[PDB]
Design a protein around this ligand. Structure first.
Ligand SMILES: [Mg+2]
Ligand SMILES: [Mg+2]
Ligand SMILES: [Mg+2]
Ligand SMILES: [Mg+2]
Ligand SMILES: [Mg+2]
Lengths: 93, 274, 93, 113, 348, 64
RNA sequence: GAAAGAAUUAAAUUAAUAUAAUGGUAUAACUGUGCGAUAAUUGUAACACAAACGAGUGAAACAAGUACGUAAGUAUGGCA
RNA sequence: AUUGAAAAAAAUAAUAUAUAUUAUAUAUAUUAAUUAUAAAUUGAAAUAUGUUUAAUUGAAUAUAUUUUAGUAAUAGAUAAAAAUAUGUACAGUAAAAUUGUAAGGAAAACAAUAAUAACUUUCUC
């Protein structure tokens, strides 16, 4: 809500193939237009963002897929295994 | 002005008058910066800090265990010595300065559950010396710093003047940024994992590096900064790049304790220790 | 001689009205050399990165655990150790 | 007026600057404000409690160590001496890494050296 | 769920507004805030996301804490400790916070902010310390009303004065104000708000308005003047406005004589002091005290000596200050005081 | 001559005037002081004309 | 037992003071910051210091107006 | 006030309106704004009106009407880099030397370098 506008003009150069994709991914804010009632106040826009609200910015070549935090050992409840709890401190008894 | 004589009058009560509160001038400023009603509000505790959590869980107990010396008493530092009163000229005399040093040194306490060493602050001093010619280089350096940290840099200016190095006084030259809390922790984690392994012949931080009291430092070249993921992702946008000094400030009594702490966070140490 | 950007009149931030610089940051997933993913907040717009050279594949951080490429390609039929032993007489130096 | 380098510097400066990039102020209703206060205060209390728990635990550990070392001194002097050495250059092992967000492909290495 | 219970706990800890309470405690962020009165403004407004579930969790946490505190509170016997426990239990209650913050503390309605309740009293004290007390202290020190009349003050009660009977207008006097002779022609009204735990039934109070700056030409200095003197006044945390209604003619040790500053005599400080009586043990009911009415004089009045005699402790103070204007002669005439002197403009 | 003398003439047209010294190319010096003829604080302005070191008017409106 | 605050003690006037040198200055007279840009204003100035006269210096107070300050108050150019 | 969502009210402060008093008070209503300001044959966005695709909404594209982009530093009552040298209000403390740190070296920048007894609040055994 309090975050700044994303300065897209810096990270994406004007008239470039990379910028275009980013633009397509994004959706713009509703501008103020004369002779119309905006019952959620008049749009306050600068660098293409509604100042009155939170901004959302949607974004080898491979998707980064993280591994499951629960394990096979955990599922089986194998007490002798070391991979059975990954988020806790295990002690040898 | 009728006079320059400064002289604060004594009072007849023990109530502490906060003068700021009695005014009606700065109503937004009466709120604390932590308070939501202040324009200075910022969400502090946004997500769980990982390095800090690790320190809390694993390291802190281990550090305490390491630093236990049995019946260790306090080691007083070098202090200002008083004069022996063996002459009437000692009577309102200022005390003799410390033995070796001109400035007084702090007492070294035994490490207990309260005063275990931990990370206090990181400072990233970048003074670009080509910016004596080009002011724009200072700006670029500041941006780089901001990118690296996710924290607002502060501009460094030339405090001194010197002819040999073509340096004026009062000229913007690079930038600095004091990281604290979670951003600092993140920056350390990035340094440990991403950047320092990509440095080729990197032995580690020197064991001869540091303050006398809980402060360790090292520096990165312009070659090393291109390994930061924010800089690396747009090498077209970053043609020039500037080195930096990295002052790590710990809550350590002595420097070996600080080194040990940093090692706990996966910092390699190579040189012969003092 | 000295290259500069000449300053305009500074904008007066009133006392109390100063606001903290909350820069626009994305949650970015870093997959390290091995499959360990880590989330970090970052200013550059990239949801996923995978790293090649990290601490998790550097020998200094784990002691217990393309000219050369070109050469290999165009001297592949010969298969270039035995070759070293053949071509290493240590009399002349 | 300005060079391409000058332009790029200006752009870079803008990235850092708060000029026309920041939203409106976060205004709240009085009920909302109260709710926020109660959220924050409770959280702060919880954090304090956690700190005390950890601090208490550390104190307990210290006491146990003290108890041990006195006993060692009483019984076997050589063992006590061995225990109480300067661990100046003690370095944490590089395998004890800072726990990641998600685990690796190979969770645990059974062979080494 | 201790904070929903009102069997033993007072009614004041709840919010009296129903809509506000409903808004506070809902299962989703569906409703809109009662504070925003206007429809369009409500429509415009958007509360921060996820606030409800977290708030509920925080409430549960602090409610549990309060309940735990209460377990101790009832076992406790000594009164100050019990009060402190009660405060600890309820201070983090959202409802009591709402009540205190957003409704008037000066003229508190009993159902909303009850100063009989310890938590609310503590809150009021804290509020006083934050601003009003500091201001009062500053005005006492700067104007030199402390050492000139009565050595020191340890502010305990918040004292506010008013002059309702003279003009007609409603205004609580800010400490160190310049009031006209018309304004201060008839007597003032005090409100002594007490924040410490005190025996309401037994504890009596005295109120003395003193004028240190009336000129004595024999001494070539000034003398004090007891302009208004009340004794043996009964206060209650909510019922605390000292008015001709409350105090009787027996309580008036020196009935109100108005500020009538002389021309060029200067600015005259009128610093009201509020003392609490000495409390005697083994005696049920309010312990009165007799004042020797021939002994104490109004034209010259040792305040410190008087305090020493009757064993008083100054808990509160307030101050205004009057100087000469056209209507002081009229005021004198009304009261039947003499014409009034006129001094030289130069302090030679 | 580095510092010249000037005559500041009262704006309330009394005829009262006060004299002050300034640097040769200093900005136009107007000041509010007491005019005893009128018995109030009024503006004073330079009666004579003179050349000034022309400063560039700093632009708050972000140009180009 | 811990955290935070209020701070206190010690040291310092070696820096800094538009400018010489001396005295003073952290209770800051030094430094930062808001407002301001007014008091680098108008008539009477006693009384002192200094003092051959001519001059010089500090200045209470009275009156008119102004600026800052919640107030107390401070400002009749600059620590001298 | 109309619109969205699913009898009222009880602070401070600000704003609007009214009146009380040789008292810058009170009453009722409401909680705005908060880092902006002219000038862009070229970038980006919205809405409206058309046409084509799978009465419909998405998607594509044309015109019109707007909105944004002039990208520029202080974000802190800033505190010994440089800059407004006289007023006032609020606040703070310098320097040297030492130990370090990428180019950096005697000499550029940044960090660190006296003591917590008692007191208040908070959490806790
Ligand atoms: Mg000197
Ligand atoms: Mg003489
Ligand atoms: Mg003479
Ligand atoms: Mg000066
Ligand atoms: Mg000055």
């Amino acid at each position: 809500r309090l975050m700044w506008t994303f300065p897209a003009y810096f990270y994406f150069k004007k008239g470039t193939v990379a910028e275009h994709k980013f633009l397509s991914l994004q959706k713009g804010p509703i501008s103020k237009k004369n002779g119309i009632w905006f019952p959620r106040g008049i749009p306050d826009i600068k660098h293409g963002r509604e100042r009155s609200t939170k901004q959302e910015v949607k974004l080898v070549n491979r998707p980064v897929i993280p591994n499951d935090r629960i394990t096979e050992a955990d599922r089986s409840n194998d007490m002798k295994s070391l991979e059975r709890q990954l988020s806790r401190t295990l002690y040898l008894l | 002005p009728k006079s320059a004589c400064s002289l604060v009058k004594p009072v007849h009560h023990l109530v502490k008058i906060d003068k700021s509160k009695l005014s009606p001038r700065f109503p937004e400023l009466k709120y604390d910066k932590s308070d939501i009603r202040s324009p200075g509000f910022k969400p502090k505790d946004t997500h769980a800090d990982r390095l800090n959590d690790h320190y809390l869980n694993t390291l802190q107990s281990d550090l305490l265990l390491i630093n236990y010396s049995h019946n260790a008493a306090v080691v007083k530092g070098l202090k200002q010595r008083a004069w022996s009163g063996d002459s009437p000229y000692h009577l309102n005399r200022p005390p003799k300065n410390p033995r070796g040093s001109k400035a007084q040194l702090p007492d070294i306490h035994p490490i207990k559950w309260s005063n275990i060493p931990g990370l206090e602050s990181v400072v990233i001093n970048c003074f670009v010396r080509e910016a004596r010619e080009n002011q724009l280089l200072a700006i670029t350096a500041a941006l780089q710093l901001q990118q690296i940290t996710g924290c607002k840099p502060h501009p460094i200016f030339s405090k001194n003047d010197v002819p040999t190095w073509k340096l004026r006084k009062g000229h913007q030259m690079g930038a600095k940024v004091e990281l604290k809390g979670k951003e600092m922790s993140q920056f350390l984690s990035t340094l440990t994992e991403i950047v320092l392994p990509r440095i080729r012949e990197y032995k580690g931080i020197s064991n001869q590096s540091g303050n006398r009291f809980g402060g360790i430092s090292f520096g990165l070249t312009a070659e090393d900064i291109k390994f930061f993921p924010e800089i690396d992702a747009n090498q077209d946008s970053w043609p020039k790049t500037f080195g930096m000094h990295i002052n790590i400030n710990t809550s350590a009594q002595l420097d070996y304790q600080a080194r040990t702490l940093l090692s706990g966070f996966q910092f390699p140490f190579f040189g012969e220790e003092k | 001689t000295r290259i500069t950007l000449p300053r305009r009149p500074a904008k007066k931030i009133q006392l109390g009205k100063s606001r903290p610089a909350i820069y626009h940051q994305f949650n970015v997933k870093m997959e390290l050399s091995d499959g360990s993913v880590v989330i970090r907040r970052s200013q550059y717009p990239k949801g996923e990165i995978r790293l090649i050279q990290d601490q998790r594949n550097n020998p200094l951080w784990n002691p217990s655990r393309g000219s050369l490429d070109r050469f290999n390609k165009r001297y592949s039929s010969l298969f270039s150790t035995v070759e070293l032993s053949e071509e290493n007489k240590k009399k002349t130096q | 007026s300005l060079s391409p380098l000058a332009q790029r510097v200006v752009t870079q400066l803008s990235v850092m600057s708060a000029s026309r990039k920041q939203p409106k102020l976060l205004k709240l209703a009085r009920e909302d404000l109260i709710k926020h206060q109660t959220i924050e205060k409770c959280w702060s209390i919880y954090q304090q409690q956690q700190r005390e728990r950890r601090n208490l635990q550390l104190e307990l550990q210290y006491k146990s160590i003290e108890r041990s070392m006195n006993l060692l001194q009483e019984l076997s002097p050589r063992l006590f001496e061995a225990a109480n050495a300067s661990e100046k250059g003690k370095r944490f092992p590089m395998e004890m890494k800072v726990p990641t967000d998600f685990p690796p492909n190979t969770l645990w290495h059974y062979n080494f050296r | 769920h201790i904070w929903s219970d009102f069997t033993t706990r007072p009614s004041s800890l709840s919010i009296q507004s129903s809509k506000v309470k409903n808004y506070l405690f809902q299962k989703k962020a569906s409703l809109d805030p009662p504070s925003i009165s206007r429809r369009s403004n409500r429509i415009k407004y958007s509360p921060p996301e996820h606030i409800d579930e977290i708030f509920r969790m925080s409430y549960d946490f602090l409610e549990q804490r309060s309940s735990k505190f209460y377990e101790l509170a009832n076992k406790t016997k000594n009164p100050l400790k019990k009060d402190a426990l009660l405060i600890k239990a309820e201070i983090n209650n959202p409802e009591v916070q709402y009540n205190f913050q957003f409704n008037n503390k000066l003229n508190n309605v009993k159902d909303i902010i009850d100063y009989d309740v310890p938590v609310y009293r503590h809150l009021g004290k804290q509020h006083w310390e934050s601003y009003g007390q500091m201001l009062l202290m500053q005005r006492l020190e700067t104007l030199a009303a402390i050492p000139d009349t009565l050595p020191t003050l340890v502010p305990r009660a918040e004292v506010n004065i008013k002059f309702p009977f003279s003009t007609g207008v409603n205004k609580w006097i800010e400490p160190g104000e310049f009031l006209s002779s018309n304004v201060t022609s008839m007597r003032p009204i005090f409100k002594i708000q007490e924040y410490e735990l005190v025996n309401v039934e037994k504890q009596l109070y005295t109120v003395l308005i003193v004028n240190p700056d009336v000129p004595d030409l024999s001494n070539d200095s000034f003398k004090t003047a007891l302009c208004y003197g009340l004794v043996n006044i009964n206060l209650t945390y909510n019922d605390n406005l000292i008015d001709p209604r409350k105090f009787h003619s027996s309580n008036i040790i020196a009935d109100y004589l108005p500020p009538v500053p002389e021309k060029n005599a200067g600015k005259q400080r009128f610093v009201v002091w509020v003392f609490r009586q000495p409390l005697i043990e083994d005696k049920q009911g309010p312990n009165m005290l007799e004042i020797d009415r021939k002994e104490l004089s109004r034209d010259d009045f040792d305040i410190r000596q008087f305090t020493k005699k009757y064993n008083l402790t100054a808990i509160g103070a307030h101050i205004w200050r009057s100087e000469w204007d056209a209507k002081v002669a009229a005021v004198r005439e009304k009261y039947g005081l003499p014409p009034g002197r006129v001094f030289s403009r130069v302090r030679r | 001559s580095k510092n010249s003398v000037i005559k500041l003439l009262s704006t309330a047209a009394s005829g009262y005037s006060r004299y002050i010294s300034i640097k040769k190319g200093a900005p136009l010096v107007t000041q509010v002081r007491y005019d005893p003829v009128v018995k109030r604080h009024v503006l004073f302005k330079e009666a004579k004309k003179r050349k000034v070191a022309e400063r560039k008017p700093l632009d708050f409106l972000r140009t180009a």
